[PDB]
Design a protein around this ligand. Sequence first.
Ligand SMILES: [Cl-]
Ligand SMILES: [Cl-]
Ligand SMILES: [Cl-]
Ligand SMILES: [Cl-]
Ligand SMILES: [Cl-]
Ligand SMILES: [Cl-]
Ligand SMILES: [Cl-]
Ligand SMILES: [Cl-]
Ligand SMILES: [Cl-]
Ligand SMILES: [Cl-]
Ligand SMILES: [Cl-]
Ligand SMILES: [Cl-]
Ligand SMILES: [Cl-]
Ligand SMILES: [Cl-]
Ligand SMILES: [Cl-]
Ligand SMILES: [Cl-]
Ligand SMILES: [Cl-]
Ligand SMILES: [Cl-]
Ligand SMILES: [Cl-]
Ligand SMILES: [Cl-]
Ligand SMILES: [Cl-]
Ligand SMILES: [Cl-]
Ligand SMILES: [Cl-]
Ligand SMILES: [Cl-]
Ligand SMILES: [Cl-]
Ligand SMILES: [Cl-]
Ligand SMILES: [Cl-]
Ligand SMILES: [Cl-]
Ligand SMILES: [Cl-]
Ligand SMILES: [Cl-]
Ligand SMILES: [Cl-]
Ligand SMILES: [Cl-]
Ligand SMILES: [Cl-]
Ligand SMILES: [Cl-]
Ligand SMILES: [Cl-]
Ligand SMILES: [Cl-]
Ligand SMILES: [Cl-]
Ligand SMILES: [Cl-]
Ligand SMILES: [Cl-]
Ligand SMILES: [Cl-]
Ligand SMILES: [Cl-]
Ligand SMILES: [Cl-]
Ligand SMILES: [Cl-]
Ligand SMILES: [Cl-]
Ligand SMILES: [Fe+2]
Ligand SMILES: [Fe+2]
Ligand SMILES: [Fe+2]
Ligand SMILES: [Fe+2]
Ligand SMILES: [Mg+2]
Ligand SMILES: [Mg+2]
Ligand SMILES: [Mg+2]
Ligand SMILES: [Mg+2]
Ligand SMILES: [Mg+2]
Ligand SMILES: [Mg+2]
Ligand SMILES: [Mg+2]
Ligand SMILES: [Mg+2]
Ligand SMILES: [Mg+2]
Ligand SMILES: [Mg+2]
Ligand SMILES: [Mg+2]
Ligand SMILES: [Mg+2]
Ligand SMILES: [Mg+2]
Ligand SMILES: [Mg+2]
Ligand SMILES: [Mg+2]
Ligand SMILES: [Mg+2]
Ligand SMILES: [Mg+2]
Ligand SMILES: [Mg+2]
Ligand SMILES: [Mg+2]
Ligand SMILES: [Mg+2]
Ligand SMILES: [Mg+2]
Ligand SMILES: [Mg+2]
Ligand SMILES: [Mg+2]
Ligand SMILES: [Mg+2]
Ligand SMILES: [Mg+2]
Ligand SMILES: [Mg+2]
Ligand SMILES: [Mg+2]
Ligand SMILES: [Mg+2]
Ligand SMILES: [Mg+2]
Ligand SMILES: [Mg+2]
Ligand SMILES: [Mg+2]
Ligand SMILES: [Mg+2]
Ligand SMILES: [Mg+2]
Ligand SMILES: [Mg+2]
Ligand SMILES: [Mg+2]
Ligand SMILES: [Mg+2]
Ligand SMILES: [Mg+2]
Ligand SMILES: [Mg+2]
Ligand SMILES: [Mg+2]
Ligand SMILES: [Mg+2]
Ligand SMILES: [Mg+2]
Ligand SMILES: [Mg+2]
Ligand SMILES: [Mg+2]
Ligand SMILES: [Mg+2]
Ligand SMILES: [Mg+2]
Ligand SMILES: [Mg+2]
Lengths: 174, 174, 174, 174
Amino acid sequence: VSQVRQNYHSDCEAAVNRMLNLELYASYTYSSMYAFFDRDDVALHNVAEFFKEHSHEEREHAEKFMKYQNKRGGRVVLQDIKKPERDEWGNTLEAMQAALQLEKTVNQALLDLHKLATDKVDPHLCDFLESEYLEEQVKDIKRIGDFITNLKRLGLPENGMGEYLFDKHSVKES
Amino acid sequence: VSQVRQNYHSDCEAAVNRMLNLELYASYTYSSMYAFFDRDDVALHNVAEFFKEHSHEEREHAEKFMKYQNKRGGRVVLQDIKKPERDEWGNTLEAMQAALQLEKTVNQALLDLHKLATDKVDPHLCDFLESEYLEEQVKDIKRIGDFITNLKRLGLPENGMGEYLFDKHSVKES
Amino acid sequence: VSQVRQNYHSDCEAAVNRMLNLELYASYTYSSMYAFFDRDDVALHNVAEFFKEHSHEEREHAEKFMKYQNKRGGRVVLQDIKKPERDEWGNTLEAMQAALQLEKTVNQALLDLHKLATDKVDPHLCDFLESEYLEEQVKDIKRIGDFITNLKRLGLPENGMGEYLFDKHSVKES
Amino acid sequence: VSQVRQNYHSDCEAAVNRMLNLELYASYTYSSMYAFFDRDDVALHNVAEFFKEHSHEEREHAEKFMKYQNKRGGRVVLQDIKKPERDEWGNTLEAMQAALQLEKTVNQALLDLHKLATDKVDPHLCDFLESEYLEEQVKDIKRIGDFITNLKRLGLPENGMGEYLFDKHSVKES
Ligand SMILES: [Cl-]
Ligand SMILES: [Cl-]
Ligand SMILES: [Cl-]
Ligand SMILES: [Cl-]
Ligand SMILES: [Cl-]
Ligand SMILES: [Cl-]
Ligand SMILES: [Cl-]
Ligand SMILES: [Cl-]
Ligand SMILES: [Cl-]
Ligand SMILES: [Cl-]
Ligand SMILES: [Cl-]
Ligand SMILES: [Cl-]
Ligand SMILES: [Cl-]
Ligand SMILES: [Cl-]
Ligand SMILES: [Cl-]
Ligand SMILES: [Cl-]
Ligand SMILES: [Cl-]
Ligand SMILES: [Cl-]
Ligand SMILES: [Cl-]
Ligand SMILES: [Cl-]
Ligand SMILES: [Cl-]
Ligand SMILES: [Cl-]
Ligand SMILES: [Cl-]
Ligand SMILES: [Cl-]
Ligand SMILES: [Cl-]
Ligand SMILES: [Cl-]
Ligand SMILES: [Cl-]
Ligand SMILES: [Cl-]
Ligand SMILES: [Cl-]
Ligand SMILES: [Cl-]
Ligand SMILES: [Cl-]
Ligand SMILES: [Cl-]
Ligand SMILES: [Cl-]
Ligand SMILES: [Cl-]
Ligand SMILES: [Cl-]
Ligand SMILES: [Cl-]
Ligand SMILES: [Cl-]
Ligand SMILES: [Cl-]
Ligand SMILES: [Cl-]
Ligand SMILES: [Cl-]
Ligand SMILES: [Cl-]
Ligand SMILES: [Cl-]
Ligand SMILES: [Cl-]
Ligand SMILES: [Cl-]
Ligand SMILES: [Fe+2]
Ligand SMILES: [Fe+2]
Ligand SMILES: [Fe+2]
Ligand SMILES: [Fe+2]
Ligand SMILES: [Mg+2]
Ligand SMILES: [Mg+2]
Ligand SMILES: [Mg+2]
Ligand SMILES: [Mg+2]
Ligand SMILES: [Mg+2]
Ligand SMILES: [Mg+2]
Ligand SMILES: [Mg+2]
Ligand SMILES: [Mg+2]
Ligand SMILES: [Mg+2]
Ligand SMILES: [Mg+2]
Ligand SMILES: [Mg+2]
Ligand SMILES: [Mg+2]
Ligand SMILES: [Mg+2]
Ligand SMILES: [Mg+2]
Ligand SMILES: [Mg+2]
Ligand SMILES: [Mg+2]
Ligand SMILES: [Mg+2]
Ligand SMILES: [Mg+2]
Ligand SMILES: [Mg+2]
Ligand SMILES: [Mg+2]
Ligand SMILES: [Mg+2]
Ligand SMILES: [Mg+2]
Ligand SMILES: [Mg+2]
Ligand SMILES: [Mg+2]
Ligand SMILES: [Mg+2]
Ligand SMILES: [Mg+2]
Ligand SMILES: [Mg+2]
Ligand SMILES: [Mg+2]
Ligand SMILES: [Mg+2]
Ligand SMILES: [Mg+2]
Ligand SMILES: [Mg+2]
Ligand SMILES: [Mg+2]
Ligand SMILES: [Mg+2]
Ligand SMILES: [Mg+2]
Ligand SMILES: [Mg+2]
Ligand SMILES: [Mg+2]
Ligand SMILES: [Mg+2]
Ligand SMILES: [Mg+2]
Ligand SMILES: [Mg+2]
Ligand SMILES: [Mg+2]
Ligand SMILES: [Mg+2]
Ligand SMILES: [Mg+2]
Ligand SMILES: [Mg+2]
Ligand SMILES: [Mg+2]
Ligand SMILES: [Mg+2]
Ligand SMILES: [Mg+2]
């Protein structure tokens, strides 16, 4: 037993490792979206940079789980990072829809981890999830939903001018 | 009944007073460690200053419970602060081992208080513990465990050179 | 055919995707080393930070291949990022030995890619490898070899004091 | 024989003069595009300025070949700069398509010169081409391809609003 370990259930330790993997998976998916929007036959560079930024954020969230694991006396166990579901992402609307689904998948896993931590009476883990993950998750879901609404308003997928304008006005110029 | 009191159970009020006492006890133990490492026949002054700092931190945490008690309309009730378990602390490894145990004792009392606050459906007290005590506790336990690992690596208790080097490189120069 | 594509062989495009994967694999291995040295029963934090930095560097090198692929009109194709070979890394000497091997594996793949680019008469790709990858690779191999020499000099694996001192003097304080 | 000349083949000297001429030709073509977009019945001034900038860049690249020739002990030999292929350039999409073709023609000539320098075992000339010409060429081809993709997305040639918006958002305001 680790000398630091206190009130940290084996099930929570394992679930933290699984959540770490999911954050890495999410990061990799966003990296794929970045590369897609940087293609010469896609060429929406502010959209590309948006997804690149989100890839980096998810990788930071994975690292934060590694640090958490060690702080509690658990042991990091890594698994393969599966490649993303798609090799090409269609257009800005399709990609944003996939991102919304991904963020809700990650949110569900965080909420499930919170249920487990609650079950095992681990208030430190509950607080960590609430303070470092749950609020920023709701904000990302809201932002992406807002974007989807605007992409539909702009006539995606058919309205190429609308898609061009979204890249200029909705996502930060990069 | 205090005019400010709302949703604050007598049992929680009493447990806050007990936790206050434990913080004061922890502070006093760290003060003893400070004085020990400042002895001319011990003379590890950065180690001494580390424990002096932790003594001050625990006293601040006691004061924060006093303020909390009054904010909720409870009444501070003080008891004797018992002297520390030992009069002399052996060496840096022995002291760090005792500090680890002390921090885990304090953590257990905080977790028990959180269980009580949860039982009595006091989300303010739960949040206070989570936001002001539980995370910094995990960090202190991790730091001290890391130190113990390094002290063993350095050949404590027998390796006096190792102990000298720990005082120069592991704890902040004071 | 991509409208930008010129003098870019399908074989080179595929090899760039494979090299991208290898950079991601290397990044992941370094992340594992970071997490290991951050364990409370390992606790060599400057060593941990060294490997964290190298993980970030390799991820940047992967991103640079993505950008390269798109600049030439190739298409990024991602595969699973395999988990690292080990779950625990022994000690600083064992980890550094594994890092040396990893950097030489990456170097060999870069040199093989250069051979292919030379075969296909692609001077842009040759220059990219020479200017962005090959020199920094030689420097990393030299640095890690120098470290291994010093770890052996310090009496690793048996000399715990030597290992402690390496973490204080050889790797940047983090 | 020039007193400075060493390892510089007559064929390479001649090919450098031909490449100089091609850079001047490219500059002149871009100047024609500038003047076209500045016409009162065309009036896309940011597009005009984009082409003016590229004209200046190509003239700088011609000058760099003159300097190179003299450094190696070759002799600059100038020929007529042929007028551009067209007197009018249609619209932003047509012009960008012609620019893409021009940049790929220049790239092919650079790659052919590199083949010759390789044949004649002239590493100085190979390095000069790789370090001063080949990478910036790939970048220009990628940028122009990205633009063409966006012009098609914006509904060129028929969508005049799309063309107006490209001039405001895609090319630097001048
Ligand atoms: Cl436990
Ligand atoms: Cl408990
Ligand atoms: Cl357990
Ligand atoms: Cl696991
Ligand atoms: Cl997993
Ligand atoms: Cl599987
Ligand atoms: Cl796909
Ligand atoms: Cl979807
Ligand atoms: Cl999903
Ligand atoms: Cl949050
Ligand atoms: Cl929007
Ligand atoms: Cl009450
Ligand atoms: Cl209530
Ligand atoms: Cl009550
Ligand atoms: Cl009481
Ligand atoms: Cl008490
Ligand atoms: Cl008593
Ligand atoms: Cl005693
Ligand atoms: Cl003890
Ligand atoms: Cl204790
Ligand atoms: Cl806290
Ligand atoms: Cl230490
Ligand atoms: Cl090709
Ligand atoms: Cl060619
Ligand atoms: Cl091919
Ligand atoms: Cl491939
Ligand atoms: Cl692969
Ligand atoms: Cl496999
Ligand atoms: Cl292992
Ligand atoms: Cl190895
Ligand atoms: Cl390897
Ligand atoms: Cl390099
Ligand atoms: Cl060294
Ligand atoms: Cl010569
Ligand atoms: Cl020679
Ligand atoms: Cl000759
Ligand atoms: Cl000539
Ligand atoms: Cl000519
Ligand atoms: Cl002629
Ligand atoms: Cl014409
Ligand atoms: Cl054309
Ligand atoms: Cl042409
Ligand atoms: Cl260049
Ligand atoms: Cl654009
Ligand atoms: Fe995340
Ligand atoms: Fe405390
Ligand atoms: Fe690399
Ligand atoms: Fe040029
Ligand atoms: Mg142990
Ligand atoms: Mg377990
Ligand atoms: Mg999973
Ligand atoms: Mg698979
Ligand atoms: Mg599809
Ligand atoms: Mg509950
Ligand atoms: Mg709660
Ligand atoms: Mg909270
Ligand atoms: Mg919050
Ligand atoms: Mg966020
Ligand atoms: Mg998110
Ligand atoms: Mg998130
Ligand atoms: Mg908003
Ligand atoms: Mg009253
Ligand atoms: Mg009472
Ligand atoms: Mg007590
Ligand atoms: Mg007594
Ligand atoms: Mg004793
Ligand atoms: Mg907190
Ligand atoms: Mg603390
Ligand atoms: Mg503490
Ligand atoms: Mg504490
Ligand atoms: Mg630390
Ligand atoms: Mg096409
Ligand atoms: Mg192919
Ligand atoms: Mg591979
Ligand atoms: Mg496997
Ligand atoms: Mg092993
Ligand atoms: Mg270099
Ligand atoms: Mg490097
Ligand atoms: Mg390297
Ligand atoms: Mg490298
Ligand atoms: Mg060096
Ligand atoms: Mg002469
Ligand atoms: Mg001649
Ligand atoms: Mg010519
Ligand atoms: Mg003529
Ligand atoms: Mg015409
Ligand atoms: Mg050769
Ligand atoms: Mg070469
Ligand atoms: Mg070079
Ligand atoms: Mg270069
Ligand atoms: Mg250029
Ligand atoms: Mg050019
Ligand atoms: Mg050029
Ligand atoms: Mg660009």
